[PDB]
Design a protein around this ligand. Structure first.
Ligand SMILES: [Ca+2]
Ligand SMILES: [Ca+2]
Ligand SMILES: [Ca+2]
Lengths: 377, 48
């Protein structure tokens, strides 16, 4: 193997690395190539390991000094391409877009209204030009907020009384139905809904104002605890979708609990006050807040919280919902779509440490909303 | 190497240019470390 001349003459594989130990390099010298240096020198004593092709189902092999790597194609894996992918929504969302479900070791992907199943079995294809959930130093009372851009926040609407003063927000769900808060109905006897609003003191021509015709409120509403704070408004005139006016999709309760509840952060948009006991915001404002665990939600709340309410906001940062955002939707940005998961309900103070805004849970009222949209439709 | 000379500078027989650093005190010698090339590429250990 080694000598005064064994490693001084010409480097040939038909000489050094063959009849002794072939420790190292003498398999690399002959070729000058560190690529198969340690993918072949393991095959000097005990024989080859990939020649059997342990990987089946058209899977390639890779040799290591003790264990074998089996590269199996998309949807195929295994120690020797032996195990199979357990189709469940736990990892990779089951390839679904909006609704993922697992049953009988199979994945059912279902899309909401306005989308159709694609023949590729991995996508939901929109059926409209403007489908739901699609977008087409800051001092002086700016608590971490940012201004909504053109088409960035099209699902927000403002409720204005006879004095044209915004007091509550609303969610655009269809051409005739608007989702808002139940207590706002007690603020004004008659009010109108303005969609596409960007500034209360400036009209850019993209704002559509419609009168409210039908009002539906929850029968079990309680004033003391603000429970069941949800309202549905059917407008007299239809809402025409455009660049700054788009609807929002309605997710499923089970699927929202499956993955939407574990989301790190969500977005709440509205025209609420910048801070507690302050002036109303002139322009639409959006804020990103994280979810709060139910244990701390119950421990930090002085009132009774049922299954229809959840805490959100920052424990330390001064970023939380305030007055004027009632009826505003909470939107989570899934792979390509914003899904409504919460409705602004109330909050113990604004920008206060140790307090989290309480938001109504949409998933607990999906059946009620569906019944309301069809009872008088 | 053949026919090569250099004048001693260190007292006790060591060739080396003495540069000035607030004086001749500096003997600018740099130590370098070296390991086998293949073990310095990738192995079961940190390079040695
Ligand atoms: Ca030999
Ligand atoms: Ca060699
Ligand atoms: Ca050799």
């Amino acid at each position: 193997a080694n000598s005064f001349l064994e490693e001084m003459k010409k480097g040939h594989l038909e000489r050094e690395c063959m009849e002794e130990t072939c420790s190292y390099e003498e398999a690399r010298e002959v070729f000058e190539d560190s690529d198969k240096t340690n993918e072949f020198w393991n095959k000097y004593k005990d024989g080859d390991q990939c020649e059997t092709s342990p990987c089946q189902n058209q899977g390639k092999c890779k040799d290591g000094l003790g264990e074998y790597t089996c590269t199996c194609l998309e949807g195929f894996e295994g120690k020797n391409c032996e195990l199979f992918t357990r189709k469940l929504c736990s990892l990779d969302n089951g390839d679904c877009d909006q609704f993922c479900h697992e049953e009988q070791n199979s994945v059912v992907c279902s899309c909401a209204r306005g989308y159709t199943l694609a023949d590729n079995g991995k996508a939901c294809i929109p059926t409209g030009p403007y489908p739901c959930g699609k977008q087409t130093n800051n001092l002086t009372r700016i608590v971490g907020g940012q201004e909504c851009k053109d088409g960035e926040c099209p699902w927000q609407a403002l409720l204005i009384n006879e004095e044209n003063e915004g007091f509550c927000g609303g969610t655009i769900l269809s051409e005739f139905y608007i989702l808002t808060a139940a207590h706002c109905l007690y603020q004004a006897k008659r009010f109108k809904v303005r969609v596409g609003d960007r500034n209360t003191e400036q009209e850019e021509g993209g704002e559509a104002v419609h009168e409210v015709e039908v009002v539906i409120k929850h029968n079990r509403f309680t004033k003391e605890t603000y429970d069941f704070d949800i309202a549905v408004l059917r407008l007299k005139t239809p809402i025409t979708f455009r660049m700054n006016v788009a609807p929002a999709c309605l997710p499923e309760r089970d699927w929202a609990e499956s993955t939407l509840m574990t989301q790190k952060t969500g977005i709440v948009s509205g025209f609420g006050r910048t801070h507690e006991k302050g002036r109303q915001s002139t322009r639409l404002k959006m804020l990103e807040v994280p979810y709060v665990d139910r244990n701390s939600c119950k421990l930090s709340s002085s009132f009774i919280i049922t299954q229809n309410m959840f805490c959100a906001g920052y424990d330390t940062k001064q970023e939380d919902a305030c007055q004027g955002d009632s009826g505003g939707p909470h939107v989570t940005r899934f792979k390509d779509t914003y899904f409504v998961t919460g409705i602004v309900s109330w909050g113990e103070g604004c920008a206060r440490k140790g307090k989290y805004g309480i938001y109504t849970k949409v998933t607990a009222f999906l059946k009620w909303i569906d019944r309301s949209m069809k009872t008088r439709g | 190497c053949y026919g090569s000379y250099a004048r001693p500078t260190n007292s006790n027989g060591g060739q080396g240019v003495m540069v000035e650093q607030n004086g001749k005190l500096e003997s600018q010698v740099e130590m370098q470390f070296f390991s086998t090339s293949t073990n310095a590429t990738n192995e079961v250990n940190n390079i040695q």
